[PDB]
From a paper:
[name] (MAYV) is an emerging arbovirus of the Americas that may cause a debilitating arthritogenic disease. Mature, infective alphaviruses are icosahedral enveloped particles of ~70 nm in diameter composed of the structural proteins capsid (C), E1 and E2. The E1 and E2 proteins are transmembrane proteins that are organized in heterodimers. Spikes are involved in the attachment to cellular receptors, cell internalization and membrane fusion.
Here we describe the structure of mature and infective MAYV particles obtained by cryo-EM at 4.4 Å resolution, allowing the observation of N-glycosylation sites in MAYV E1–E2 spikes. The presence of the E3 protein was not observed, nor in the cryo-EM density map, even with a low-density threshold value, nor in SDS-PAGE gel carried out with the purified MAYV used for cryo-EM data collection. The high frequency of histidine residues forming the E1–E2 interface reflect the plasticity of E1–E2 pH-dependent interaction and their role in the spike assembly/disassembly process. MAYV has two predicted N-glycosylation sites: N141 in E1 and N262 in E2. N-Glycosylation at MAYV E2 N262 protrudes in a long, continuous and branched density in direction to a symmetric N-glycosylation at the neighbouring E2, which is reminiscent of a molecular handshake. The N262 handshake glycosylation site is located at the center of the MXRA8 interaction site and potentially participates in the interaction with the host MXRA8 receptor. The MAYV density map suggests the extra density could be occupied by a fatty acid that may enhance interactions between E1 and E2.
Numbering used by the authors:
A (entry chain C): 371 to 419
B (entry chain A), C (entry chain J): 107 to 258
The structure:
Amino acid sequence: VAVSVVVLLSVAASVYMCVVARNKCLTPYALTPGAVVPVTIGVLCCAPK
Amino acid sequence: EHDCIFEVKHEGKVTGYACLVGDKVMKPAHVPGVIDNIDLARLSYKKSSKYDLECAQIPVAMKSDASKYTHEKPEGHYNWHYGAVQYTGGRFTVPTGVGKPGDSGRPIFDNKGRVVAIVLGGANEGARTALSVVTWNKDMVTKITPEGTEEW
Amino acid sequence: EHDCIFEVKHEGKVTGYACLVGDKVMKPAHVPGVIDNIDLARLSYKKSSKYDLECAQIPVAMKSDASKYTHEKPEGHYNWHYGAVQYTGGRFTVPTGVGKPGDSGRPIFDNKGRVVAIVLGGANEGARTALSVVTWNKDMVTKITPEGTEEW
Protein backbone atom coordinates (compact mmCIF):
# COMPACT_ATOMS: atom_id res chain seq x y z
CA VAL A 1 0.00 0.00 0.00
CA ALA A 2 2.94 2.35 0.62
CA VAL A 3 4.42 1.91 -2.83
CA SER A 4 0.98 2.35 -4.40
CA VAL A 5 0.34 5.63 -2.59
CA VAL A 6 3.81 6.96 -3.37
CA VAL A 7 3.40 6.08 -7.06
CA LEU A 8 0.04 7.87 -7.04
CA LEU A 9 1.41 10.98 -5.34
CA SER A 10 4.58 11.14 -7.46
CA VAL A 11 2.56 10.98 -10.68
CA ALA A 12 0.13 13.58 -9.34
CA ALA A 13 2.91 15.99 -8.34
CA SER A 14 4.62 15.59 -11.72
CA VAL A 15 1.38 16.30 -13.60
CA TYR A 16 0.52 19.23 -11.31
CA MET A 17 3.92 20.83 -11.82
CA CYS A 18 3.87 20.22 -15.59
CA VAL A 19 0.47 21.84 -16.01
CA VAL A 20 1.35 24.82 -13.85
CA ALA A 21 4.52 25.27 -15.93
CA ARG A 22 2.37 25.26 -19.08
CA ASN A 23 -0.06 27.68 -17.44
CA LYS A 24 2.77 30.06 -16.58
CA CYS A 25 4.08 29.73 -20.14
CA LEU A 26 0.77 30.64 -21.78
CA THR A 27 -0.06 33.63 -19.56
CA PRO A 28 1.71 36.61 -21.25
CA TYR A 29 -0.07 35.76 -24.52
CA ALA A 30 -3.63 36.02 -23.18
CA LEU A 31 -2.90 39.38 -21.54
CA THR A 32 -1.60 41.60 -24.28
CA PRO A 33 -3.77 43.35 -26.85
CA GLY A 34 -2.89 41.68 -30.14
CA ALA A 35 -2.82 37.89 -30.43
CA VAL A 36 0.18 36.22 -32.05
CA VAL A 37 0.32 32.69 -30.44
CA PRO A 38 3.35 31.50 -32.46
CA VAL A 39 4.44 28.22 -34.03
CA THR A 40 4.41 26.35 -30.68
CA ILE A 41 0.61 25.82 -31.06
CA GLY A 42 1.06 22.14 -30.12
CA VAL A 43 0.24 22.75 -26.43
CA LEU A 44 -2.17 25.64 -26.91
CA CYS A 45 -5.72 26.48 -25.80
CA CYS A 46 -5.89 29.87 -27.57
CA ALA A 47 -8.12 28.81 -30.48
CA PRO A 48 -9.82 31.68 -32.31
CA LYS A 49 -6.97 34.11 -33.24
CA GLU B 1 -18.34 56.81 -23.87
CA HIS B 2 -14.71 57.77 -24.40
CA ASP B 3 -13.37 57.46 -20.85
CA CYS B 4 -12.63 53.71 -20.64
CA ILE B 5 -12.98 53.83 -16.84
CA PHE B 6 -16.21 51.84 -16.30
CA GLU B 7 -15.85 52.47 -12.59
CA VAL B 8 -14.90 49.47 -10.46
CA LYS B 9 -17.24 50.02 -7.50
CA HIS B 10 -17.01 48.03 -4.26
CA GLU B 11 -19.45 48.16 -1.33
CA GLY B 12 -21.30 50.84 -3.25
CA LYS B 13 -18.33 53.21 -3.28
CA VAL B 14 -15.55 53.08 -5.88
CA THR B 15 -12.07 51.54 -5.64
CA GLY B 16 -10.47 52.18 -9.04
CA TYR B 17 -10.97 51.50 -12.73
CA ALA B 18 -10.39 49.05 -15.58
CA CYS B 19 -10.07 49.47 -19.31
CA LEU B 20 -11.40 47.84 -22.46
CA VAL B 21 -8.86 47.65 -25.28
CA GLY B 22 -8.79 45.80 -28.58
CA ASP B 23 -10.65 42.65 -27.60
CA LYS B 24 -10.02 42.56 -23.87
CA VAL B 25 -11.48 43.87 -20.64
CA MET B 26 -8.36 44.30 -18.52
CA LYS B 27 -8.57 45.04 -14.77
CA PRO B 28 -5.44 45.85 -12.77
CA ALA B 29 -5.32 42.84 -10.46
CA HIS B 30 -3.98 45.12 -7.70
CA VAL B 31 -7.54 46.37 -7.09
CA PRO B 32 -10.27 44.37 -5.31
CA GLY B 33 -13.92 44.47 -6.40
CA VAL B 34 -16.21 44.21 -9.38
CA ILE B 35 -17.00 46.89 -11.96
CA ASP B 36 -20.15 49.03 -12.07
CA ASN B 37 -21.50 47.51 -15.29
CA ILE B 38 -23.83 44.52 -15.03
CA ASP B 39 -23.31 42.28 -18.07
CA LEU B 40 -19.52 42.55 -17.83
CA ALA B 41 -19.38 40.21 -14.85
CA ARG B 42 -19.74 36.61 -16.14
CA LEU B 43 -16.23 36.39 -17.60
CA SER B 44 -13.38 34.04 -16.69
CA TYR B 45 -10.78 36.60 -15.66
CA LYS B 46 -7.33 35.01 -15.86
CA LYS B 47 -4.90 35.97 -13.10
CA SER B 48 -1.26 36.91 -13.64
CA SER B 49 0.67 36.98 -10.39
CA LYS B 50 4.11 38.60 -10.87
CA TYR B 51 2.51 41.58 -12.63
CA ASP B 52 -1.04 42.57 -11.82
CA LEU B 53 -3.35 41.97 -14.75
CA GLU B 54 -6.80 40.41 -14.84
CA CYS B 55 -7.57 40.16 -18.54
CA ALA B 56 -10.56 38.39 -20.03
CA GLN B 57 -11.89 38.02 -23.56
CA ILE B 58 -14.77 40.24 -24.67
CA PRO B 59 -18.08 38.44 -25.38
CA VAL B 60 -19.91 38.46 -28.70
CA ALA B 61 -21.24 41.80 -30.01
CA MET B 62 -20.10 43.61 -26.85
CA LYS B 63 -20.00 47.06 -28.60
CA SER B 64 -16.34 46.64 -29.58
CA ASP B 65 -15.58 50.35 -29.90
CA ALA B 66 -12.41 50.06 -27.86
CA SER B 67 -9.23 52.06 -28.24
CA LYS B 68 -6.40 51.24 -30.63
CA TYR B 69 -3.08 49.80 -29.44
CA THR B 70 0.13 50.77 -31.28
CA HIS B 71 3.21 49.00 -29.91
CA GLU B 72 5.55 51.95 -30.31
CA LYS B 73 6.36 55.17 -28.46
CA PRO B 74 8.13 58.25 -29.80
CA GLU B 75 9.25 60.66 -27.11
CA GLY B 76 7.42 63.86 -26.26
CA HIS B 77 3.99 64.85 -24.95
CA TYR B 78 1.10 62.38 -24.63
CA ASN B 79 -2.41 62.75 -23.27
CA TRP B 80 -3.61 61.77 -19.80
CA HIS B 81 -6.91 62.14 -17.97
CA TYR B 82 -5.54 64.87 -15.70
CA GLY B 83 -3.05 66.44 -18.11
CA ALA B 84 -0.10 65.80 -20.40
CA VAL B 85 2.64 63.26 -19.76
CA GLN B 86 6.27 63.75 -20.78
CA TYR B 87 8.20 60.73 -22.07
CA THR B 88 11.98 61.00 -22.40
CA GLY B 89 14.71 58.37 -22.55
CA GLY B 90 12.50 55.54 -21.32
CA ARG B 91 11.57 57.49 -18.20
CA PHE B 92 7.96 58.39 -17.78
CA THR B 93 6.92 61.29 -15.55
CA VAL B 94 4.36 64.03 -14.83
CA PRO B 95 3.82 66.77 -12.21
CA THR B 96 4.14 65.48 -8.65
CA GLY B 97 1.18 64.88 -6.36
CA VAL B 98 -1.40 66.36 -8.72
CA GLY B 99 -2.53 62.84 -9.54
CA LYS B 100 -4.89 61.45 -6.92
CA PRO B 101 -3.92 58.33 -4.92
CA GLY B 102 -6.63 56.23 -6.59
CA ASP B 103 -6.46 56.71 -10.36
CA SER B 104 -5.50 53.08 -10.76
CA GLY B 105 -6.67 52.01 -14.21
CA ARG B 106 -6.24 55.15 -16.23
CA PRO B 107 -4.55 54.47 -19.58
CA ILE B 108 -2.41 56.80 -21.68
CA PHE B 109 -2.75 57.62 -25.37
CA ASP B 110 -1.19 59.95 -27.93
CA ASN B 111 -2.67 63.06 -29.49
CA LYS B 112 -4.64 60.87 -31.89
CA GLY B 113 -5.85 58.42 -29.26
CA ARG B 114 -3.57 55.43 -29.79
CA VAL B 115 -3.34 53.93 -26.30
CA VAL B 116 -0.19 52.22 -25.22
CA ALA B 117 0.41 51.85 -21.47
CA ILE B 118 -1.70 51.52 -18.31
CA VAL B 119 -0.93 52.87 -14.84
CA LEU B 120 -0.19 51.60 -11.32
CA GLY B 121 0.52 54.71 -9.24
CA GLY B 122 2.96 57.35 -8.07
CA ALA B 123 5.00 58.68 -5.14
CA ASN B 124 6.44 61.96 -3.81
CA GLU B 125 9.92 62.79 -5.11
CA GLY B 126 10.11 66.45 -6.18
CA ALA B 127 8.21 68.36 -8.84
CA ARG B 128 8.35 65.42 -11.30
CA THR B 129 7.08 62.02 -10.14
CA ALA B 130 7.94 58.57 -11.45
CA LEU B 131 4.88 56.79 -12.86
CA SER B 132 5.14 53.12 -11.96
CA VAL B 133 3.46 51.29 -14.84
CA VAL B 134 2.75 47.87 -16.13
CA THR B 135 2.51 48.26 -19.90
CA TRP B 136 1.49 46.35 -22.99
CA ASN B 137 4.03 46.97 -25.73
CA LYS B 138 6.72 45.20 -27.74
CA ASP B 139 4.18 42.44 -28.51
CA MET B 140 4.15 41.35 -24.84
CA VAL B 141 3.42 42.83 -21.44
CA THR B 142 5.87 43.98 -18.80
CA LYS B 143 6.18 46.06 -15.64
CA ILE B 144 8.38 49.06 -15.00
CA THR B 145 8.10 50.06 -11.37
CA PRO B 146 10.91 52.31 -10.12
CA GLU B 147 12.44 52.23 -6.70
CA GLY B 148 10.40 53.95 -4.01
CA THR B 149 7.17 54.45 -5.98
CA GLU B 150 4.56 52.82 -3.78
CA GLU B 151 1.36 51.72 -5.48
CA TRP B 152 -1.73 53.92 -5.65
CA GLU C 1 -17.45 51.51 -60.40
CA HIS C 2 -18.85 48.73 -62.57
CA ASP C 3 -16.34 45.95 -63.11
CA CYS C 4 -18.52 42.98 -64.17
CA ILE C 5 -19.46 41.23 -60.96
CA PHE C 6 -21.53 38.18 -61.87
CA GLU C 7 -24.64 36.96 -60.08
CA VAL C 8 -25.86 33.41 -59.49
CA LYS C 9 -29.53 32.90 -60.28
CA HIS C 10 -31.94 30.09 -59.45
CA GLU C 11 -35.77 29.92 -59.69
CA GLY C 12 -35.84 33.72 -60.06
CA LYS C 13 -33.70 34.69 -57.06
CA VAL C 14 -30.13 36.02 -57.03
CA THR C 15 -27.78 35.94 -54.04
CA GLY C 16 -24.50 34.32 -55.17
CA TYR C 17 -22.14 36.94 -56.64
CA ALA C 18 -19.04 35.56 -58.30
CA CYS C 19 -16.09 37.73 -59.23
CA LEU C 20 -13.19 37.13 -61.57
CA VAL C 21 -9.69 38.62 -61.39
CA GLY C 22 -6.53 37.98 -63.39
CA ASP C 23 -6.80 34.40 -64.60
CA LYS C 24 -8.99 32.87 -61.90
CA VAL C 25 -12.74 32.99 -61.34
CA MET C 26 -13.10 33.32 -57.56
CA LYS C 27 -16.56 32.36 -56.31
CA PRO C 28 -17.89 32.05 -52.76
CA ALA C 29 -19.24 28.53 -52.39
CA HIS C 30 -22.72 29.22 -50.98
CA VAL C 31 -26.17 29.08 -52.67
CA PRO C 32 -25.66 26.63 -55.60
CA GLY C 33 -27.47 26.95 -58.89
CA VAL C 34 -24.46 27.91 -61.05
CA ILE C 35 -24.44 31.22 -62.97
CA ASP C 36 -26.76 32.13 -65.85
CA ASN C 37 -23.82 32.66 -68.22
CA ILE C 38 -23.43 29.12 -69.53
CA ASP C 39 -20.48 30.15 -71.70
CA LEU C 40 -18.83 30.86 -68.32
CA ALA C 41 -20.58 28.11 -66.34
CA ARG C 42 -19.62 25.07 -68.43
CA LEU C 43 -16.20 25.13 -66.72
CA SER C 44 -15.39 22.44 -64.15
CA TYR C 45 -14.42 24.45 -61.07
CA LYS C 46 -12.23 23.31 -58.20
CA LYS C 47 -13.70 23.67 -54.70
CA SER C 48 -11.74 24.17 -51.47
CA SER C 49 -13.50 23.37 -48.23
CA LYS C 50 -10.96 25.11 -46.00
CA TYR C 51 -11.22 28.48 -47.73
CA ASP C 52 -14.85 28.14 -48.94
CA LEU C 53 -13.66 29.35 -52.34
CA GLU C 54 -14.37 28.30 -55.91
CA CYS C 55 -11.43 28.54 -58.27
CA ALA C 56 -12.67 28.14 -61.83
CA GLN C 57 -10.21 28.86 -64.65
CA ILE C 58 -11.41 31.65 -66.98
CA PRO C 59 -11.89 31.08 -70.72
CA VAL C 60 -9.36 32.81 -72.91
CA ALA C 61 -12.03 34.74 -74.83
CA MET C 62 -12.68 36.61 -71.55
CA LYS C 63 -9.08 37.89 -71.65
CA SER C 64 -10.04 41.52 -71.03
CA ASP C 65 -12.96 41.37 -68.59
CA ALA C 66 -11.24 41.32 -65.22
CA SER C 67 -9.52 43.76 -62.87
CA LYS C 68 -6.08 44.43 -61.49
CA TYR C 69 -5.11 43.47 -57.95
CA THR C 70 -2.40 43.60 -55.29
CA HIS C 71 -0.55 41.34 -52.89
CA GLU C 72 -0.07 43.99 -50.19
CA LYS C 73 -2.61 45.70 -47.93
CA PRO C 74 -1.81 49.37 -47.31
CA GLU C 75 -3.34 51.25 -44.38
CA GLY C 76 -6.33 53.58 -44.28
CA HIS C 77 -9.98 53.58 -45.34
CA TYR C 78 -11.52 52.46 -48.62
CA ASN C 79 -14.76 52.04 -50.58
CA TRP C 80 -17.02 49.21 -51.68
CA HIS C 81 -20.33 48.45 -53.41
CA TYR C 82 -22.30 49.98 -50.53
CA GLY C 83 -20.21 52.52 -48.61
CA ALA C 84 -16.91 53.05 -46.87
CA VAL C 85 -14.69 50.50 -45.13
CA GLN C 86 -12.08 51.12 -42.44
CA TYR C 87 -9.10 48.76 -42.28
CA THR C 88 -6.79 49.39 -39.34
CA GLY C 89 -4.80 47.25 -36.94
CA GLY C 90 -4.96 44.40 -39.45
CA ARG C 91 -8.74 43.97 -39.67
CA PHE C 92 -11.78 45.28 -41.52
CA THR C 93 -15.05 46.94 -40.57
CA VAL C 94 -18.03 48.06 -42.63
CA PRO C 95 -19.51 51.52 -42.62
CA THR C 96 -22.39 51.44 -40.12
CA GLY C 97 -24.57 48.32 -40.01
CA VAL C 98 -26.12 48.02 -43.49
CA GLY C 99 -25.24 44.55 -44.69
CA LYS C 100 -27.82 41.87 -45.41
CA PRO C 101 -27.60 38.12 -46.04
CA GLY C 102 -26.77 37.08 -49.57
CA ASP C 103 -24.23 39.82 -50.33
CA SER C 104 -21.34 37.34 -50.27
CA GLY C 105 -19.23 38.16 -53.31
CA ARG C 106 -18.69 41.81 -53.64
CA PRO C 107 -15.03 42.91 -53.85
CA ILE C 108 -13.29 45.67 -51.91
CA PHE C 109 -11.04 48.27 -53.55
CA ASP C 110 -8.33 50.87 -52.90
CA ASN C 111 -8.31 54.58 -53.68
CA LYS C 112 -6.69 53.97 -57.07
CA GLY C 113 -8.20 50.82 -58.59
CA ARG C 114 -6.98 47.48 -57.22
CA VAL C 115 -9.03 44.79 -55.47
CA VAL C 116 -8.27 43.06 -52.16
CA ALA C 117 -11.07 41.53 -50.12
CA ILE C 118 -13.86 39.12 -51.09
CA VAL C 119 -16.49 38.90 -48.34
CA LEU C 120 -18.16 35.69 -47.11
CA GLY C 121 -19.73 36.40 -43.73
CA GLY C 122 -19.85 38.91 -40.93
CA ALA C 123 -20.51 39.59 -37.27
CA ASN C 124 -23.10 41.97 -35.84
CA GLU C 125 -22.02 44.02 -32.84
CA GLY C 126 -23.71 47.40 -32.99
CA ALA C 127 -22.11 50.54 -34.40
CA ARG C 128 -19.26 49.30 -36.64
CA THR C 129 -19.87 45.84 -38.05
CA ALA C 130 -17.31 43.10 -38.68
CA LEU C 131 -16.90 40.80 -41.67
CA SER C 132 -14.75 37.86 -42.77
CA VAL C 133 -12.87 38.11 -46.06
CA VAL C 134 -10.28 36.14 -47.94
CA THR C 135 -7.31 38.25 -48.98
CA TRP C 136 -3.94 38.07 -50.65
CA ASN C 137 -0.44 37.78 -49.31
CA LYS C 138 2.26 37.13 -51.94
CA ASP C 139 0.72 33.92 -53.36
CA MET C 140 0.18 32.52 -49.83
CA VAL C 141 -3.55 33.18 -49.44
CA THR C 142 -5.53 32.58 -46.25
CA LYS C 143 -8.89 33.24 -44.61
CA ILE C 144 -9.57 35.60 -41.72
CA THR C 145 -12.74 35.78 -39.64
CA PRO C 146 -13.97 37.83 -36.71
CA GLU C 147 -15.40 35.92 -33.78
CA GLY C 148 -19.17 36.13 -33.46
CA THR C 149 -20.27 35.80 -37.07
CA GLU C 150 -23.25 34.50 -38.96
CA GLU C 151 -22.34 33.44 -42.49
CA TRP C 152 -24.02 35.67 -45.04
